[PDB]
Scaffold this motif. Structure first.
Motif, PDB file in Angstrom:
ATOM      1  N   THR A   1      34.126  35.500  83.735  1.00 37.83           N
ATOM      2  CA  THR A   1      34.911  36.230  83.290  1.00 37.83           C
ATOM      3  C   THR A   1      35.430  35.699  84.983  1.00 37.83           C
ATOM      4  O   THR A   1      35.321  35.832  85.794  1.00 37.83           O
ATOM      5  CB  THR A   1      35.468  37.138  83.009  1.00 37.83           C
ATOM      6  OG1 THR A   1      35.036  38.446  83.613  1.00 37.83           O
ATOM      7  CG2 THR A   1      34.111  37.510  81.762  1.00 37.83           C
ATOM      8  N   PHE A   2      37.221  36.026  84.382  1.00 36.99           N
ATOM      9  CA  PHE A   2      37.723  35.969  85.401  1.00 36.99           C
ATOM     10  C   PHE A   2      39.147  36.848  85.641  1.00 36.99           C
ATOM     11  O   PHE A   2      39.250  37.477  84.561  1.00 36.99           O
ATOM     12  CB  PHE A   2      38.485  34.609  86.020  1.00 36.99           C
ATOM     13  CG  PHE A   2      39.609  34.417  85.811  1.00 36.99           C
ATOM     14  CD1 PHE A   2      40.694  34.315  85.805  1.00 36.99           C
ATOM     15  CD2 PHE A   2      39.270  33.229  84.019  1.00 36.99           C
ATOM     16  CE1 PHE A   2      41.762  33.761  85.384  1.00 36.99           C
ATOM     17  CE2 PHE A   2      40.840  33.148  83.466  1.00 36.99           C
ATOM     18  CZ  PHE A   2      41.485  33.383  83.710  1.00 36.99           C
TER      19      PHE A   2
ATOM     20  N   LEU B   1      43.343  37.952  85.412  1.00 37.25           N
ATOM     21  CA  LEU B   1      44.694  38.368  85.828  1.00 37.25           C
ATOM     22  C   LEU B   1      45.582  39.572  85.531  1.00 37.25           C
ATOM     23  O   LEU B   1      45.181  40.440  84.796  1.00 37.25           O
ATOM     24  CB  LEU B   1      44.657  37.314  84.320  1.00 37.25           C
ATOM     25  CG  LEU B   1      46.178  36.310  84.158  1.00 37.25           C
ATOM     26  CD1 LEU B   1      46.768  35.916  85.463  1.00 37.25           C
ATOM     27  CD2 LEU B   1      46.575  35.959  82.777  1.00 37.25           C
TER      28      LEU B   1
ATOM     29  N   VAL C   1      45.234  36.291  90.171  1.00 32.92           N
ATOM     30  CA  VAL C   1      44.765  36.249  89.624  1.00 32.92           C
ATOM     31  C   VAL C   1      42.821  36.471  90.524  1.00 32.92           C
ATOM     32  O   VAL C   1      43.288  36.296  92.463  1.00 32.92           O
ATOM     33  CB  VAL C   1      44.402  34.296  90.129  1.00 32.92           C
ATOM     34  CG1 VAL C   1      43.027  33.598  89.229  1.00 32.92           C
ATOM     35  CG2 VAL C   1      45.634  33.717  89.049  1.00 32.92           C
ATOM     36  N   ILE C   2      42.341  36.866  89.298  1.00 29.66           N
ATOM     37  CA  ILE C   2      40.972  37.369  90.038  1.00 29.66           C
ATOM     38  C   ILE C   2      40.247  36.698  90.668  1.00 29.66           C
ATOM     39  O   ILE C   2      39.804  36.146  88.907  1.00 29.66           O
ATOM     40  CB  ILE C   2      40.744  39.084  90.737  1.00 29.66           C
ATOM     41  CG1 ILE C   2      42.019  39.571  90.564  1.00 29.66           C
ATOM     42  CG2 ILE C   2      39.042  39.489  91.091  1.00 29.66           C
ATOM     43  CD1 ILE C   2      43.246  39.689  91.716  1.00 29.66           C
ATOM     44  N   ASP C   3      39.040  35.710  91.284  1.00 23.33           N
ATOM     45  CA  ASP C   3      38.017  35.311  91.052  1.00 23.33           C
ATOM     46  C   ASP C   3      36.677  36.170  90.217  1.00 23.33           C
ATOM     47  O   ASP C   3      36.908  36.892  90.991  1.00 23.33           O
ATOM     48  CB  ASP C   3      37.567  34.528  92.300  1.00 23.33           C
ATOM     49  CG  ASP C   3      38.809  33.432  92.545  1.00 23.33           C
ATOM     50  OD1 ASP C   3      39.487  32.899  91.396  1.00 23.33           O
ATOM     51  OD2 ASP C   3      38.888  33.095  94.287  1.00 23.33           O
ATOM     52  N   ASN C   4      35.870  35.267  89.798  1.00 18.55           N
ATOM     53  CA  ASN C   4      34.585  36.112  89.094  1.00 18.55           C
ATOM     54  C   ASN C   4      33.677  36.937  90.359  1.00 18.55           C
ATOM     55  O   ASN C   4      33.511  37.966  90.016  1.00 18.55           O
ATOM     56  CB  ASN C   4      33.749  34.796  88.808  1.00 18.55           C
ATOM     57  CG  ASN C   4      32.598  35.951  88.294  1.00 18.55           C
ATOM     58  OD1 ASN C   4      31.710  36.094  89.311  1.00 18.55           O
ATOM     59  ND2 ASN C   4      32.519  36.458  87.305  1.00 18.55           N
ATOM     60  N   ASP C   5      33.666  36.261  91.733  1.00 15.92           N
ATOM     61  CA  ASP C   5      32.826  36.752  92.417  1.00 15.92           C
ATOM     62  C   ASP C   5      33.456  37.178  93.782  1.00 15.92           C
ATOM     63  O   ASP C   5      33.184  37.562  94.673  1.00 15.92           O
ATOM     64  CB  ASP C   5      31.711  35.125  93.081  1.00 15.92           C
ATOM     65  CG  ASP C   5      32.911  34.046  93.788  1.00 15.92           C
ATOM     66  OD1 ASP C   5      33.946  33.586  93.452  1.00 15.92           O
ATOM     67  OD2 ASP C   5      32.021  33.369  93.842  1.00 15.92           O
TER      68      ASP C   5
ATOM     69  N   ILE D   1      43.394  42.441  83.458  1.00 17.91           N
ATOM     70  CA  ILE D   1      43.114  41.322  81.705  1.00 17.91           C
ATOM     71  C   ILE D   1      41.482  40.487  82.318  1.00 17.91           C
ATOM     72  O   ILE D   1      41.626  39.800  83.387  1.00 17.91           O
ATOM     73  CB  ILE D   1      44.634  40.919  81.690  1.00 17.91           C
ATOM     74  CG1 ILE D   1      45.192  41.686  80.565  1.00 17.91           C
ATOM     75  CG2 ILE D   1      44.433  39.561  80.420  1.00 17.91           C
ATOM     76  CD1 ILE D   1      46.050  41.081  80.306  1.00 17.91           C
ATOM     77  N   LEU D   2      40.998  40.438  81.460  1.00 19.10           N
ATOM     78  CA  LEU D   2      39.917  39.957  81.874  1.00 19.10           C
ATOM     79  C   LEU D   2      39.587  38.445  80.504  1.00 19.10           C
ATOM     80  O   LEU D   2      39.992  38.496  79.462  1.00 19.10           O
ATOM     81  CB  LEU D   2      38.336  40.714  81.364  1.00 19.10           C
ATOM     82  CG  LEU D   2      38.454  41.651  82.523  1.00 19.10           C
ATOM     83  CD1 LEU D   2      36.859  42.469  81.869  1.00 19.10           C
ATOM     84  CD2 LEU D   2      38.368  40.942  83.587  1.00 19.10           C
ATOM     85  N   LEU D   3      39.213  37.129  81.220  1.00 18.45           N
ATOM     86  CA  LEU D   3      39.576  36.227  80.840  1.00 18.45           C
ATOM     87  C   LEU D   3      38.428  35.334  80.504  1.00 18.45           C
ATOM     88  O   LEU D   3      36.979  35.299  81.683  1.00 18.45           O
ATOM     89  CB  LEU D   3      40.845  35.142  81.343  1.00 18.45           C
ATOM     90  CG  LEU D   3      42.411  36.016  80.164  1.00 18.45           C
ATOM     91  CD1 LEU D   3      43.438  35.061  80.410  1.00 18.45           C
ATOM     92  CD2 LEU D   3      42.054  36.136  78.712  1.00 18.45           C
ATOM     93  N   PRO D   4      37.701  34.311  79.739  1.00 17.56           N
ATOM     94  CA  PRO D   4      36.784  33.290  79.929  1.00 17.56           C
ATOM     95  C   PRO D   4      37.116  32.490  81.155  1.00 17.56           C
ATOM     96  O   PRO D   4      38.274  32.203  81.315  1.00 17.56           O
ATOM     97  CB  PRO D   4      37.304  33.035  78.456  1.00 17.56           C
ATOM     98  CG  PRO D   4      37.598  32.440  77.966  1.00 17.56           C
ATOM     99  CD  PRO D   4      38.778  34.548  78.933  1.00 17.56           C
ATOM    100  N   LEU D   5      35.870  31.560  82.130  1.00 19.29           N
ATOM    101  CA  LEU D   5      36.005  31.398  82.928  1.00 19.29           C
ATOM    102  C   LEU D   5      35.228  30.297  82.358  1.00 19.29           C
ATOM    103  O   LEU D   5      34.092  30.363  81.799  1.00 19.29           O
ATOM    104  CB  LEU D   5      35.321  31.641  83.875  1.00 19.29           C
ATOM    105  CG  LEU D   5      34.817  30.997  85.176  1.00 19.29           C
ATOM    106  CD1 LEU D   5      36.135  30.826  85.671  1.00 19.29           C
ATOM    107  CD2 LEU D   5      34.807  31.773  86.435  1.00 19.29           C
ATOM    108  N   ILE D   6      35.944  29.071  82.029  1.00 17.49           N
ATOM    109  CA  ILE D   6      35.683  27.850  81.647  1.00 17.49           C
ATOM    110  C   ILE D   6      35.093  27.204  82.554  1.00 17.49           C
ATOM    111  O   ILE D   6      35.788  26.806  83.392  1.00 17.49           O
ATOM    112  CB  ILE D   6      37.027  27.451  80.893  1.00 17.49           C
ATOM    113  CG1 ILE D   6      37.311  27.978  79.662  1.00 17.49           C
ATOM    114  CG2 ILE D   6      36.824  25.532  80.836  1.00 17.49           C
ATOM    115  CD1 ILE D   6      38.631  27.318  79.368  1.00 17.49           C
TER     116      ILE D   6
END
Lengths: 114, 114, 114
Positions: free
Chosen positions: B49-50, B52, B70-74, B102-107
């Motif tokens: 996830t990433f 927003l 934008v917040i990166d996964n890591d 807001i958490l969203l899928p990281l494609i």
């Protein structure tokens, strides 16, 4: 009004967003700051999704800024567009597409409600 | 601080976003331009996830603009809210909810890192 | 140009977004209002996804605002960055990363095209 989101349409099959228009003619000026434009469209959203309200490119470029709006899954009120004239006077005619509703997955987490 | 995102809470079970507050009282004016407000909350995010970061509607309408973050996964640093007073002087009190995560899928894609 | 999105790169493996740069040196001032910066990158996007164009944090904080851009799945034109200088004069050098492309799932609905 009251119309559900299933009544909205897409510009094309590949369109990410569902089109949103204001139900009123309104004039916006820079000194006015954020205004909430009525659409006459109401939640709720399909199961396991939330909504993101964003501007259209062509309208952004004509100097009407749409502030990102987040629509919760179970919101049953009216969807409104939060908008601001950037630099100049902007005129919104009834029926002109101003924003779009984008549906996204609602990811489940263990975060507490409070 | 340092608190992980698992400590954040949702307003309601249907809420898309996790609430974020500033840890300081701060005043913002239009001539100041973008300011980074501290939250004391830190990444990283759940796997695949990433994040927003977006404004809340009620706060947007009171003339505090949150720029999309934008917040990166890591990312393991502090989550900050990038904010600007639009038209008038805005006062942010410690503890007032200003933004949401807001958490969203990281494609996954085959794009190269570089 | 014309380069497809498969040519874009990520800053790090955990990066949500693919980096976007302007192909020109351009100066922006607050009185100019929204400008569309050329990237030389073109859709379309991978199947069942759409794109979101957002600013980078560091660039937002230097007073260049990127307005959210939505890229449809089957758009084959050029990806452009809609940008505005907030408070001061901003100078964009060829090659400086200004925005990012984030890929998200395209959710299917029964909404009509029209």
């Amino acid at each position: 009004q009251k119309q559900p989101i299933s009544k909205l349409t897409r510009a094309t099959p590949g369109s990410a967003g569902l089109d949103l228009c204001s139900t009123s003619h309104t004039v916006l000026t820079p000194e006015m700051g954020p205004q909430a434009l009525s659409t006459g469209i109401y939640g709720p959203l399909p199961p396991n999704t939330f909504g993101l309200i964003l501007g259209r490119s062509s309208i952004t470029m004509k100097g009407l800024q749409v502030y990102p709006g987040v629509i919760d899954n179970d919101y049953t009120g009216e969807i409104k567009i939060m908008a601001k004239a950037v630099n100049n006077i902007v005129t919104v005619s009834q029926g002109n597409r101003i924003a779009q509703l984008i549906l996204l997955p609602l990811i489940e987490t263990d975060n507490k409600v409070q």
